[PDB]
């Protein structure tokens, strides 16, 4: 999986293109603004320990450490992205990025106050989503919280040709928001809250799309027209498909006890 991601969706240039549209230090939907919103009801402090699964360019960890002073540990399977994240943070012993496979990584039981993941678990097969959430359950402190956003979808029976091709090319495994919540419940999480945030996601996509268009000249200087068209068309399809609920954006929050 590592090689597939590093050589395709998350090549160095692919990562930089995503950062252009999502915002500095982000390769996830909504960049900084979405992060502020998603964390708005979360309480942590300087003694908290946080795990970020799919930490990307490190924006999430940077924000969490800035806002709360928490210890943050980000894991990402792509070595190249971790190397980039490490270049953007210095002199801060409370931010650590690690290139590793979360499915084989070992952490102590009852370790984290928050396990956080933004648009990263879509890369895992259904079997591995379940395995991951079982591990997360163990790794959370009894008082801990799981907080996730992820790409989701309508039932597969409803997918059209274009959407099938996108999912296949990306090698995503997209399940419904309801199926996702059921996995958390099966893993014994408590107070499972799921939100279909597709409308909000559509708003974020529109802001990003507008930004791309208004900054086209700069984009073309940094990248190429070919890459612009690919990015533009990709956002157009996500806007269309989120509007009609074919591609969805799921939010999940749960606790260990």
Swiss-Prot record:
Changing residue 238 to A/M: Abolishes activity. Gene3D superfamilies: Vaccinia Virus protein VP39 (3.40.50.150). Changing residue 10 to F: Reduces activity. Changing residue 119 to E: Reduces activity when phosphoethanolamine is used as substrate. Slightly increases activity when phospho-dimethylethanolamine is used as substrate. Changing residue 10 to A: Abolishes activity. It comes from the Eukaryota. The keyword Lipid metabolism applies. Induction: Transcription is down-regulated by choline. Proteasomal degradation is promoted by choline. Phosphoethanolamine binds at residues 9, 18, 151, 166, 170, 172, 238. It holds the Pfam family Methyltransf_25. Inhibited by phosphocholine. Inhibited by hexadecylphosphocholine (miltefosine). Inhibited by S-adenosyl-l-homocysteine. Weakly inhibited in vitro by amodiaquine, chloroquine and primaquine. Inhibited by NSC-158011. The active site is at residues 10, 123. GO terms for molecular function: phosphoethanolamine N-methyltransferase activity. Disruption phenotype: Lack of phosphoethanolamine N-methyltransferase activity and disruption of phosphocholine synthesis from phosphoethanolamine. Growth and morphological defects in trophozoites and schizonts. Lower levels of parasitemia in the intraerythrocytic culture. Reduced number of nuclei in the majority of schizonts. Reduced viability of intraerythrocytic parasites. Reduced gametocyte production. Defects in gametocyte maturation resulting in the absence of stage-IV and -V gametocytes. Lack of oocyst development in mosquitoes. It catalyses: phosphoethanolamine + S-adenosyl-L-methionine = N-methylethanolamine phosphate + S-adenosyl-L-homocysteine + H(+); N-methylethanolamine phosphate + S-adenosyl-L-methionine = N,N-dimethylethanolamine phosphate + S-adenosyl-L-homocysteine + H(+); N,N-dimethylethanolamine phosphate + S-adenosyl-L-methionine = phosphocholine + S-adenosyl-L-homocysteine + H(+). S-adenosyl-L-methionine binds at residues 27-28, 54, 76-77, 101-102, 118. One of its GO terms (biological process) is phosphatidylcholine biosynthetic process. It is an enzyme of class 2 (transferase). Changing residue 54 to A: No effect on activity. InterPro entries: Methyltransf_25, SAM-dependent_MTases_sf. Catalyzes N-methylation of phosphoethanolamine, phosphomonomethylethanolamine and phosphodimethylethanolamine, the three methylation steps required to convert phosphoethanolamine to phosphocholine. Has no ethanolamine- or phosphatidylethanolamine-N-methyltransferase activity. Required for gametocyte development, maturation and transmission to mosquitoes and for oocyst formation in the mosquito midgut. Synthetic inhibitors of PMT block gametocyte development. Monomer. This is Phosphoethanolamine N-methyltransferase.
